[PDB]
């Protein structure tokens, strides 16, 4: 069934508008993280931005055309330090997966748009992990554990792949000479 | 002076919301142009998307924080063939530089935000050239002149830089073997 005139139609566009702004905000926060010396976090912001582009794309492809008026609130700014940006990003994700998407999914099911309702629910899952990632990094910054841990571990240079073993990432990579900012905890997800 | 409570504050966020959606739409149209076999046009859509990201960034940095409600209409879809996408993109740019930005600049000046008004006016200039580019490519497609002209000229392969001299781009690049889709008119802007 068509979406024309349905509340779901406006909800999809509203989600698209929000996801679109989130993509820009995350890319900006990614640039700020770079300036603040947090390369892994910067790349995480950029990856999240690209994933928001994909949520938006799925939503956009459901629309049938024409201009549609929407009424919604969005974050008017701002770009602060990385810790603050991570906190603000997490808060935005929280609202999306706890309030917005469940509401949109609910209304979709009500109006008879099952496929779309399920897509809203699925996107909410992605947003929750996005929040987890942001909250975890904010915590690392607050606890001063971004580049230092209590026990010896392995740190990988994102720039060249050098692996450093120790309680903390080195001031400079011994292989590529790039600063500590490029190091992350060595991760294996395969 | 602060922007809080001013119409300009809402106009900036509205512009940001629109520029944000345009970035996504242009990236999607860029992907469709690739599928349609128009590499130069695809790269132009991607470049325009990146520039929209920059208009949005300038606008975003003027905001002072907090959640703000906005009321505006946006294109609910859609992704069609490249010619149609170029036409729809041009129409959107036209509205922005003829109606929206001049109005926002006008109101900014009225409320006493000179710097911001001038930024709105400046962005409008960029949008007009964006439209010109889109309209020119739509015309090339309509006239069947994307890869063929009446007089012998030079065609450059965007993939490897090979330069072909003739009335039209070759079916396959003789250097890198990529399809005609990668060719553009050789351009010199320096
Ligand atoms: Fe999102
Ligand atoms: Fe998200
Ligand atoms: Fe624009
Ligand atoms: Fe534009
Ligand atoms: Zn290194
Ligand atoms: Zn070639």
From Swiss-Prot, chains A, B:
Residues 1-145 form the Ferritin-like diiron domain. GO terms for molecular function: iron ion binding; oxidoreductase activity. The keyword Metal-binding applies. Fe(3+) 2 binds at residues 52, 93, 127, 130. Its cofactor is Fe(3+). It comes from the Bacteria. Binds 3 Fe(3+) ions per subunit. Keywords: Cytoplasm, Electron transport, Iron, Metal-binding, Transport, Zinc. It is found in: Cytoplasm. Fe(3+) 3 binds at residues 157, 160, 173, 176. Residues 152-190 form the Rubredoxin-like domain. Fe(3+) 1 binds at residues 19, 52, 96, 127. One of its GO terms (cellular component) is cytoplasm. May provide oxidative stress protection via catalytic reduction of intracellular hydrogen peroxide. PANTHER family: RUBRERYTHRIN-RELATED (PTHR43865:SF1). Homodimer. Possesses two rubredoxin-like centers and two non-sulfur oxo-bridged di-iron centers per dimer. This is Rubrerythrin. It comes from Nitratidesulfovibrio vulgaris (strain ATCC 29579 / DSM 644 / CCUG 34227 / NCIMB 8303 / VKM B-1760 / Hildenborough) (Desulfovibrio vulgaris). The lineage of its organism: Bacteria, Pseudomonadati, Thermodesulfobacteriota, Desulfovibrionia, Desulfovibrionales.
């Amino acid at each position: 069934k068509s979406l024309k005139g349905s509340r779901t139609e406006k909800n999809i566009l509203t989600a698209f508008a929000g996801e679109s702004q989130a993509r820009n905000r995350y890319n900006y926060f990614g640039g700020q993280a770079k300036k603040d010396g947090f390369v892994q976090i910067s790349d995480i912001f950029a990856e999240t931005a690209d994933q928001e582009r994909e949520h938006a794309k799925r939503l956009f492809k459901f629309l049938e055309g024409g201009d549609l008026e929407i009424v919604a609130a969005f974050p008017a700014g701002i770009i602060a330090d990385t810790h603050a940006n991570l906190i603000a990003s997490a808060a935005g994700e929280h609202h999306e997966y706890t309030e917005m998407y469940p509401s949109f999914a609910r209304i979709a099911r009500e109006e008879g748009y099952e496929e779309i309702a399920r897509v809203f629910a699925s996107i909410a899952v992605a947003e929750e992990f996005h929040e987890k990632r942001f909250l975890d990094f904010a915590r690392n910054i607050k606890e001063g554990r971004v580049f230092l841990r209590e026990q010896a571990t392995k740190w990988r240079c994102r720039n060249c792949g050098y692996v450093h073993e120790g309680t903390g990432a080195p001031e400079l990579c011994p292989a590529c000479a790039h600063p500590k900012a490029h190091f992350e905890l060595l991760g294996i997800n395969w």
